Design a protein around this ligand. Structure first.
Ligand code: FES
Ligand SMILES: [Zn+2]
Lengths: 52, 54, 168, 119, 110, 77, 193, 86, 295
């Protein structure tokens, strides 16, 4: 009845949280825009037409 | 005012309990302050895009 | 035939004939009785005939028996508040014992009637669903409403196969 | 099945058979399947006119007020049913769609008259 | 008065006193046999905290649930010794007895 | 439906969602109707919430609940 | 064949031909199903008349073309109802095919609906405990002020022409993606002449 | 089977024999007739004055098949099958 | 000042209860239904008399007279006239409050018309919606055809008047127009053919008597009671008639003459009775047979 511990799950959970704080993208990366195509180079997603 | 059905049920409940008041039921909307939809929201409680550069 | 003396005791009908439904305070009921002696006869019949009926109506109350530990038989109830209720049963018959405990620690007929009514509110007649939970499965079972297509084919005008055909 | 976040909603669960729709009004977690687990059934809605030419709608108003008071949301078709019953105000789009229908038929009546005048 | 322990009050028989300040108690309940419709005893073990180490193997005790378990298996405490082994006091008369016989007649103190 | 790990369809890469056209008169009228409608519905929701809280308190510490609690306690003694 | 009793089917049961063939016993008394084993199938055959052809052992109804299952021929219908319990015998009881058993069940129910066939009608209790009609749900509700004056329940139900400055503001906000400005709608719903 | 059947059927006690043996009225209760008591047999001799003793629990032997059927626990695909009128 | 009695007055209920009678054999007639094997008990003479006493008590509950109500007034109340909804729907909506713990006569049942009007449902719509969501055993959403005039005459020809009243009681409400129409047509058929014995020992006899007394047509029932040696009932019928018609020719004649017992039937037979001649003859025949038994 005693659930077998899942150590790899806890290990990976902490490693992911750590890498998300040490490799976090900055505002200059997230919120940059290509004014010719009107897309964000960080994700390649276009902006809505009403904001162009 | 109350919606038509809600009003009729509030009045019917008065008369069942012996109340003979003729005052109209009324919704108080003073406490309901309607903000414009473009009112600045709380930035502290807003999320942030996660790391995954293309 | 069914084994043992008085096999009627081992029937659901007999077990449901108990009229003692303890209040929520009763947590334990100990029974001290003697196997021999004319003055403990009613307590022995109480253990033989009624204890099963009491346990059946009160499944979560602990009932523990003790034989020949004291000179006379008695019942003792332990309540949730910590109070203990001693009941001397020597010389009393098993029917007088059942009527006694029902009076001091049993729910009255009024309290039981109310509980049964609050249960009926869980199966609303107007709700539709499986037979296990509802009287009717679909509104099509109500006379006057459009019946189920599995029994009465719908007019061609009320079928999408011909609505799209005409529109297309 | 504990969902991430979510909330209760009063909405229409589709029943019946092909070409014979029938709705059950239910309070359920918004993440649950349309016709799956619900918290409580609050009424029903038969959209097909019966032999008396009526669309029957059952509303458990006592329990509808209870679940709204417990933080339950309302789907848009449910809000319009309550507006038609007089329990809520008429939804803004029931009023606007009615005006659109009036302007639409005012143009058709004008086109019909112009055609008869030419004839 | 609240408690996270399921069994709030239970009576049982002490079957072990080898743990320090802990009495091992056997508790029996009547469980209906669905096929035979006959009640049979179903026994379960409980560890009860006994601060004064006054429990003896064979005595009948009353256990009270603790607010929270004090150990992995210790969820109750000794609330009262109902029947001390070999030293029973008749609750009906308050006199000492040995089985179904009085050791002091109830007529002694009238 | 897709998961966030499934790739975007290639036939939808260049899709640009153009917003609808706006009728100024109807747009403004509809905007005022939603404000009035949602103000009235919020006033109703507040009353229903107060009813739910009143019934819970009444069943816990009401005059009929505390009275029935003392009666039961008296009958027990 | 053509039965001369199709118009007045109750006459056949009163004729001498019927009395000689059946006497005072039910028409299904001497019928027996042919089947293997001791336990018969739990459904009778679907029909004894298949494309105007009769099977070899036709059921009590199908073997006599003068017996007409009609809601008025109550003397025939009573033979398929238990006189002590009022229940309709299931088809294997008498051996009638499924086709005729359905026609019997419908004729029996139709005869009861017309009062031609006696059945037990219990004595029920009233629906309501109180018969008062004073509650507002079944009485008059004091009309609201708007309903008396003839106004909409809420003022925002009506169309109100917006100011010109607010329309200019929206024409700038959505410049290049505008429709034609709509005016007040008709006061009533038009109708096709 | 035949010999046993005739033995049982020939050794049955009628209601009149029961009334004469116990000197009491034999009253029949029918659910279709409600609480109406129906006297089916009365003793030809004198009628007793002391009621029949009402044992709180009868010590009669029960048939498990009858009890199991009354409790809905009897499951058989061969019971209660539709058959021709007998 | 001086109110005339109602149907549920203790004095009227006591009179109609005695006139109804209590026949255990008819009140507890064997029903044609699914049967079970009967049970048997051994009883002394005292236990049998007690069992018979309890049966009489259970019968007096089964003979409880339904209250006679006046016809309900039609419902015509508008809650709102939302003209903006005109022409947006082709079918009307019926909204029923199905909250469990509400008396059915207090439930709100409203209708949204295609014209935009929100009105309360009519009595016929109410009873139909209540049966849809709170189905009562024995009631149908669609009116059975048995209540048509052609089918009721078939029931009357078979002397099944009590079945008609049992069907009517299960289908319609006591204050409904259909309920009152069927009861009056059944009472009138009993009066025309002298079938008053069909309703004796039933819960419908009092309602029938109440109908004859109010409509001043007790001559038939009065003759039936004298022919059956029920003068105690025939005398109460004339007294109940005077109580509900105090300012009448017969009521005054009884006061002026201080009539009592059979004398009341003679005073009534001469003044207000329409078949006065047939009552005197029927009453004369009774007194003769009573004298022969005395001699
Ligand atoms: S089950 Fe109701 S429409 Fe098919
Ligand atoms: Zn056939």
């Amino acid at each position: 009845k005693k659930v077998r511990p899942r150590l790899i799950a806890e290990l990976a959970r902490r490693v992911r949280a750590l890498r998300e704080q040490l490799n976090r993208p900055r505002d200059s990366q997230l919120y940059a825009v290509d004014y010719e195509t009107l897309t964000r180079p960080f994700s390649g997603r276009r902006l809505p037409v009403r904001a162009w | 005012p109350y919606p038509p059905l809600l009003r009729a049920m509030i009045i019917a409940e008065r008369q069942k309990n012996g109340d003979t008041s003729t005052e109209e039921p009324m919704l108080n909307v003073q406490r309901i302050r309607m903000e414009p939809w473009d009112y600045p929201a709380k930035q502290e409680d807003k999320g942030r895009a996660k790391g995954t550069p293309v | 035939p069914m084994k043992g003396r008085f096999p009627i005791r081992r029937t659901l009908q007999y077990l449901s004939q108990g009229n003692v439904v303890f209040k929520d305070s009763v947590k334990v009921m100990t029974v001290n009785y003697n196997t021999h002696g004319e003055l403990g006869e009613g307590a022995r019949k109480f253990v033989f005939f009624n204890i099963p009926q009491i346990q059946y109506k009160n499944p979560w109350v602990q009932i523990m028996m003790f034989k020949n530990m004291t000179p006379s038989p008695f019942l003792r109830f332990y309540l949730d508040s910590g109070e203990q209720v001693l009941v001397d049963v020597e010389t009393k018959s098993n029917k007088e014992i059942m009527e006694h405990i029902r009076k001091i620690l049993g729910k009255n007929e009024e309290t039981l009637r109310e509980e049964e009514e609050e249960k009926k509110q869980l199966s609303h007649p107007a709700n539709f669903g499986p037979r296990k939970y509802c009287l009717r499965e679909c509104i099509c079972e109500v006379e006057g409403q459009v019946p189920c297509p599995s029994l009465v084919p719908l007019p061609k005008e009320m079928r999408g196969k011909y609505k799209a055909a005409l529109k297309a | 099945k504990a969902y991430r976040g979510g909330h209760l909603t009063i909405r229409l669960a589709l029943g019946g058979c092909t070409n014979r729709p029938f709705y059950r009004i239910v309070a359920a977690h918004n993440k649950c399947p349309r016709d799956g687990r619900f918290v409580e059934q609050l009424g029903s809605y038969d959209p097909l006119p019966n032999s008396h030419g009526e669309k029957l709608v059952a509303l458990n108003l006592d329990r509808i007020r209870h679940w709204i008071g417990c933080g339950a949301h309302l789907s848009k078709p449910m809000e319009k049913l309550l507006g038609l019953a007089g329990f809520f105000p008429l939804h803004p789009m029931m009023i606007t769609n009615a005006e659109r229908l009036r302007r639409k038929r005012a143009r058709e009546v004008l086109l019909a008259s112009q055609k008869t005048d030419a004839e | 008065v609240r408690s996270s322990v399921h069994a709030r009050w239970i009576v049982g028989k002490v079957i072990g006193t080898k743990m320090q300040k802990t009495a091992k108690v056997r508790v029996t309940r009547l469980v209906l046999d669905p096929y035979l419709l006959k009640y049979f005893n179903k026994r379960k073990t409980y560890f009860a905290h006994d601060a004064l180490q006054q429990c003896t193997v064979g005595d009948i005790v009353l256990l009270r649930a603790l607010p929270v378990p004090r150990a992995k298996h210790v969820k109750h405490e000794l609330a009262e010794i109902v029947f001390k082994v070999g030293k029973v006091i008749d609750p009906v008369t308050g006199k000492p007895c040995a089985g179904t016989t009085y050791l002091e007649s109830p007529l002694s103190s009238e | 439906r897709k998961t966030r790990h499934d790739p975007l369809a290639k036939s939808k890469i260049e899709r640009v969602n153009m917003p609808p056209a706006v009728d100024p008169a109807e747009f403004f009228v509809l905007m005022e109707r939603y404000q009035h409608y949602r103000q009235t519905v919020r006033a109703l929701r507040m009353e229903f919430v107060s009813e739910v809280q009143r019934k819970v308190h009444e069943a816990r510490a009401g005059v009929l609940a505390e009275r029935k609690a003392l009666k039961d306690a008296a009958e027990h003694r | 064949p053509i039965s001369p009793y199709k118009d007045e089917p109750w006459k056949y049961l009163e004729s001498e031909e019927y009395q000689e063939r059946y006497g005072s016993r039910p028409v299904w008394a001497d019928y027996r199903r042919n089947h293997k084993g001791g336990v018969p199938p739990q459904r009778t055959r679907k029909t004894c008349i298949r494309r105007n052809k009769v099977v070899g052992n036709p059921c009590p109804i199908c073997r006599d073309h003068k017996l007409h299952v009609d809601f008025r021929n109550v003397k025939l219908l009573e033979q398929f109802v238990c006189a002590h319990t009022g229940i309709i015998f299931y088809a294997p009881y008498t051996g009638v095919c499924v086709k005729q058993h359905k026609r019997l069940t419908q004729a029996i129910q139709k005869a009861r609906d017309h009062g031609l066939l006696i059945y037990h009608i219990p004595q029920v209790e009233p629906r309501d405990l109180d018969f008062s009609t004073s509650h507002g749900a079944v009485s008059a509700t004091p009309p609201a002020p708007t309903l008396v004056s003839g106004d909409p329940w809420y003022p925002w139900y009506n169309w109100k022409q917006p100011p010109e400055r607010e329309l200019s503001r929206l024409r700038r906000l959505y410049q290049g993606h505008l429709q034609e400005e709509s005016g007040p709608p008709p006061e009533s719903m038009p109708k096709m002449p | 089977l035949t010999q046993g059947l005739f033995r049982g059927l020939s050794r049955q006690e009628t209601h009149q024999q029961l009334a004469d043996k116990k000197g009491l009225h034999v009253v029949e209760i029918r659910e279709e007739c409600g609480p109406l008591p129906i006297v089916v047999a009365s003793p030809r001799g004198p009628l007793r004055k002391d009621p029949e003793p009402e044992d709180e629990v009868p010590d009669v032997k029960l048939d498990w098949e009858d009890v199991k059927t009354a409790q809905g626990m009897k499951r058989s695909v061969w019971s209660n099958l539709k058959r021709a009128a007998t | 000042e001086t109110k005339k009695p109602t149907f549920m007055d203790e004095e009227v209920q006591s009179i109609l209860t005695k006139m109804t009678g209590l026949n255990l054999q008819k009140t507890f007639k064997p029903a044609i239904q699914e049967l079970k094997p009967p049970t048997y008990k051994l009883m002394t003479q005292a236990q049998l008399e007690e069992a018979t006493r309890q049966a009489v008590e259970a019968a007096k509950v089964r003979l409880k007279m339904p209250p006679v109500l006046e016809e309900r007034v039609p419902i015509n109340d508008v809650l709102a006239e939302d003209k903006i909804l005109e022409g947006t729907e082709t079918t009307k909506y019926v909204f029923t409050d199905i909250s469990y713990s509400i008396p059915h006569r207090e439930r709100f049942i409203v209708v949204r018309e295609p014209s935009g009007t929100l009105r309360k449902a009519s009595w016929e719509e109410r009873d139909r919606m209540i049966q849809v969501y709170f189905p009562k055993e024995g009631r149908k959403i669609l009116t059975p055809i048995i209540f048509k005039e052609e089918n009721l005459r078939t029931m009357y020809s078979q002397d099944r008047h009590v079945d008609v009243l049992n069907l009517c009681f299960a289908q319609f409400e006591p204050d409904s127009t259909e309920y009152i129409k069927v009861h009056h047509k059944t009472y009138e058929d009993i009066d025309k053919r002298g079938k008053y014995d069909l309703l004796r020992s039933t819960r419908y006899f009092g309602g029938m008597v109440w109908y004859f007394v109010n409509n001043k047509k007790i001559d038939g029932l009065l003759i039936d009671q004298i022919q059956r040696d029920l003068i105690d009932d025939a005398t109460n019928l004339v007294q109940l008639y005077h109580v509900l018609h105090p300012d009448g020719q017969s009521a005054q004649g009884a006061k002026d003459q201080a009539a009592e017992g059979i004398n009341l039937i003679k005073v009534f037979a001469k003044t207000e009775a329409q078949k006065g001649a047939y009552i005197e003859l029927t009453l004369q025949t009774y007194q003769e047979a009573l004298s022969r038994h005395s001699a």
